[PDB]
Amino acid sequence: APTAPSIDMYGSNNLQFSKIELAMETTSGYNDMVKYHELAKIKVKFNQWSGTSGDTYNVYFDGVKVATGAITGSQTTASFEYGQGGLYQMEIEACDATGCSKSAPVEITIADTDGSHLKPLTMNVDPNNKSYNTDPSIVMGTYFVEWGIYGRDYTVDNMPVDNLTHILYGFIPICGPNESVKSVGGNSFNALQTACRGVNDYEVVIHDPWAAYQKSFPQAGHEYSTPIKGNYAMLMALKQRNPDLKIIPSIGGGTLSDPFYDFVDKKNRDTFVASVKKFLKTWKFYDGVDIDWEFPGGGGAAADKGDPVNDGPAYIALMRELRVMLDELEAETGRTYELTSAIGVGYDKIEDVDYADAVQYMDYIFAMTYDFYGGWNNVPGHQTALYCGSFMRPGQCDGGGVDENGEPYKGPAYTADNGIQLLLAQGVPANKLVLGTAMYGRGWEGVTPDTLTDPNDPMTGTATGKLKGSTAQGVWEDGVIDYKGIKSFMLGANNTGINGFEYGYDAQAEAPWVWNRSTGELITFDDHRSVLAKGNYAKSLGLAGLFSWEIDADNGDILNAMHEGMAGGV
Ligand SMILES: CCCn1cnc2c1c(=O)n(CCCCC(C)=O)c(=O)n2C
Ligand SMILES: CCCn1cnc2c1c(=O)n(CCCCC(C)=O)c(=O)n2C
Ligand SMILES: CCCn1cnc2c1c(=O)n(CCCCC(C)=O)c(=O)n2C
């Protein structure tokens, strides 16, 4: 017989609650911005403006009582805790000694990071991406980058997810020594220093919380009060659409690998592995972990770091210790968690790790069979070729011979086949290796015809510097160009070459190029033909599948050719 409660929607955070508390309007340390609770804190204000209020309230979700407390006046705030994400019809009842009166039901949301409160994501994929029916057991992976939402304007709902089995989210940094990040300029280091305030060294953090969970995406149905927004809320809604798609955070990458060189100390590994466990319990849409340490032994961005005696065994120990932790999560959740790693494939990188030992702990190795040549120097070559190119010298392919100064080659050439063969020779099983495809070109200026030793092959020339171009042409950093920019501005509709560029293909290497003989611009990349050759290769060797770097740079053609090539190999 009291008055039925009316729910104050605006005073109850629009009935949006969450197991994860996320700061939405600042940028601070990771431990200050992100706190995961086993029970969501619920606070609901209700009013009884007319008649009597009664003395007690009960709260129901879907008919089931979840809380009770005192009413002592005409406005009451009910505070309680609840453990399970999703959407529930809430009713609040006010009671006196004579009876109870229930409010009309209203939907409350309790966010959780598995996306249990979310509908399947609405997609907006470029229709140049075709449908395939590739065997679900073949890996078809790609990297999606956190910063691609900015100038590149490529968001989670643009991914052709039905053509993927694995999405690797690039990149999760590690707090600690990170000089390599400073050298890249822009805000990357300042963002990391901010994220790491109040965080122990060697723990993972989110690099850009605005892209990860603050930015409101209208296509995802985000509102002011939505407790999780950003790329991460869209990836959660994507798992509701595609529950078998594996979404895996990639830790490190070329500029964020400096802290790994301190993993020779096991206490730093222990700190890192515990931070990864907490991260996967905080962000439950993730299905494992991908380690992108570039590179054990060195030769990467940190010129002053790298230990070829100890980094190998440390990498192996880290995989073993991650697999231990992941087994604990599997035991706790009843889920399967995957452990993978993207690795360098030059002989001088592979020689520093016993991968047959490491891979026993791992589901897949993503062989980075790209970046073999590029604008960091003026020597052209195929950056992602399967085999040795026509431009190579006698003895250069297998490392038997000498360079132009007569100095012995130190090891076999940088090609995808040389890397895969070295890894098989160590005893890595073929069915754990994933072959990489580039959705980008690398390139140079100044490779003009007077510099060539073979007049029909620009790979025999000499550059003056890195390729330059505008972001309108897909050039986001000197020396690199999106595949879709090569296609729009250099190849043209017919693949015969436009804007002063001509197309060529080195059939021995399985590698395309475009070359502008007057500016000397020369770009090495992957195309439909070379990607079919890679798929025929992967199928011949019984590799696990193919993956690509990075998805925003494709227009459909490369991912289509990945599926075609895997269907089509002979
Ligand atoms: C986490 C979401 C709640 N939340 C939302 N915005 C927040 C917080 C928060 O908790 N802290 C400080 C945390 C106290 C010290 C610690 C060990 O974390 C903040 O500064 N900001 C801006
Ligand atoms: C804005 C995109 C430029 N951009 C180009 N390359 C980039 C970035 C970038 O931003 N971040 C992350 C740091 C966060 C910076 C910010 C504005 O919050 C990166 O790691 N890389 C490699
Ligand atoms: C962010 C990465 C791009 N990047 C920026 N500077 C670079 C690279 C790069 O990729 N490689 C090739 C690594 C060798 C890989 C192999 C086949 O072993 C480089 O040598 N330098 C100087």
**CATH number where 462 lies:** 3.10.50.10
Q: Report whether residue 294 contacts ligand 3, using a CB cutoff of 6 Å.
A: no
Q: How far apart are CA 109 and CA 233, in angstroms?
A: 14
Select from 147, 250, 305, 371 the residue to mutate for testing ligand 3; criterion: most ligand atoms less than 8 Å from CB. 371
Q: How far apart are CA 521 and CA 62, in angstroms?
A: 65
The answer to whether residues 209 and 277 belong to one domain is yes
The answer to whether residues 408 and 371 belong to one domain is yes
Experimental method: X-ray
The residues, any chain, with a CB within 8 Å of residue 414's CB and separated by 6 or more, are: 345, 346, 372, 373, 381
Rounded to a whole number of angstroms, the distance between the first and last alpha carbons of the chain is 79
The residues, any chain, with a CB within 8 Å of residue 190's CB and separated by 6 or more, are: none
Which residue type is seen at 555?
A: N
415's tokens = 């090609």
Q: Report whether residue 21 contacts ligand 1, using a CB cutoff of 6 Å.
A: yes
Residue 98 backbone class (left: φ over 0; alpha: ψ -120 to 50; beta: rest): alpha
Q: How far apart are CA 99 and CA 90, in angstroms?
A: 19
200's tokens = 């122990």
The answer to whether residues 283 and 380 belong to one domain is yes
Domain boundary, last residue among 66, 81, 111: 111
The CA 378 to ligand 3 mean position distance, Å, reads: 14
The CA 485 to ligand 3 mean position distance, Å, reads: 22
**CATH number where 375 lies:** 3.20.20.80
Tell me the resolution in Å: 1.8
Domain boundary, last residue among 80, 111, 142: 111
Q: Which residues of 523-553 are buried (b: 16+ CB within 10 A; e: fewer)?
A: bbbbbebbbbbbbbbbbebebbbbbbbbbbb
The answer to whether residues 555 and 570 belong to one domain is yes
Burial of 99 (0-12, 13-18, 19+ CB in 10 A): exposed
Domain boundary, last residue among 61, 82, 111: 111
Check if the beta carbon of residue 132 is closer than 8 Å to that of residue 563.
yes
Check if the beta carbon of residue 417 is closer than 8 Å to that of residue 387.
yes
The answer to whether residues 61 and 134 belong to one domain is no
Alpha helix positions (H), 427-527: 483-486
**Looking at 381-519, which runs of residues are DSSP E strands?**
433-438, 440-445, 465-466, 480-482, 501-506, 511-516
How many separate domains does the chain show?
Answer: 3
Q: CA angle 452-456-457, nearest 5°?
A: 60
Select from 32, 113, 229 the residue to mutate for testing ligand 1; criterion: most ligand atoms less than 8 Å from CB. 32
What is the number of the ligand closest to the CA of 195?
2
- Ligand 3 atom with the smallest distance to the CA of 414 is 17
Query: How many other C-beta atoms can be found within 10 angstroms of the C-beta atom of residue 460?
Result: 18
Q: How far apart are CA 162 and CA 569, in angstroms?
A: 22
The answer to whether residues 357 and 390 belong to one domain is yes
The answer to whether residues 99 and 117 belong to one domain is no
Check if the beta carbon of residue 527 is closer than 8 Å to that of residue 554.
no
DSSP classification of residue 401: S
The answer to whether residues 517 and 540 belong to one domain is no
Check if the beta carbon of residue 123 is closer than 8 Å to that of residue 155.
no
**Could you give phi then psi for residue 4, rounded to 5 degrees?**
-65, 135
Per the document, the length of the chain is 570
The residues, any chain, with a CB within 8 Å of residue 508's CB and separated by 6 or more, are: 387, 388, 389, 390
Please report where in the chains the tokens 């050719």 appear, as a residue.
561
Among candidate residues 411, 415, 403, 418, the one with its CA nearest the CA of residue 371: 415
Q: How far apart are CA 445 and CA 463, in angstroms?
A: 6
Q: How far apart are CA 294 and CA 348, in angstroms?
A: 12
Cross-strand pairs, 261: none
Q: Report whether residue 150 contacts ligand 3, using a CB cutoff of 6 Å.
A: no
The answer to whether residues 196 and 290 belong to one domain is yes
Among candidate residues 200, 209, 215, the one with its CA nearest the CA of residue 259: 200
Q: Report whether residue 190 contacts ligand 1, using a CB cutoff of 6 Å.
A: no
Q: How far apart are CA 263 and CA 311, in angstroms?
A: 8
Check if the beta carbon of residue 229 is closer than 8 Å to that of residue 298.
no
Q: How far apart are CA 77 and CA 59, in angstroms?
A: 12
Q: Report whether residue 183 contacts ligand 1, using a CB cutoff of 6 Å.
A: no
The answer to whether residues 564 and 506 belong to one domain is no
What is the number of the ligand closest to the CA of 211?
2
**CATH number where 86 lies:** 2.60.40.10
Pick the catalytic residue: 91, 93, 294, 445? 294
Range of the domain at 343: 112-438+525-570
Q: How far apart are CA 539 and CA 567, in angstroms?
A: 9
Please report where in the chains the tokens 């009013």 appear, as a residue.
47
The answer to whether residues 86 and 173 belong to one domain is no
Among candidate residues 48, 68, 41, 55, the one with its CA nearest the CA of residue 8: 48
The CA 386 to ligand 2 mean position distance, Å, reads: 31
Among candidate residues 9, 87, 94, the one with its CA nearest the CA of residue 43: 9
The answer to whether residues 119 and 166 belong to one domain is yes
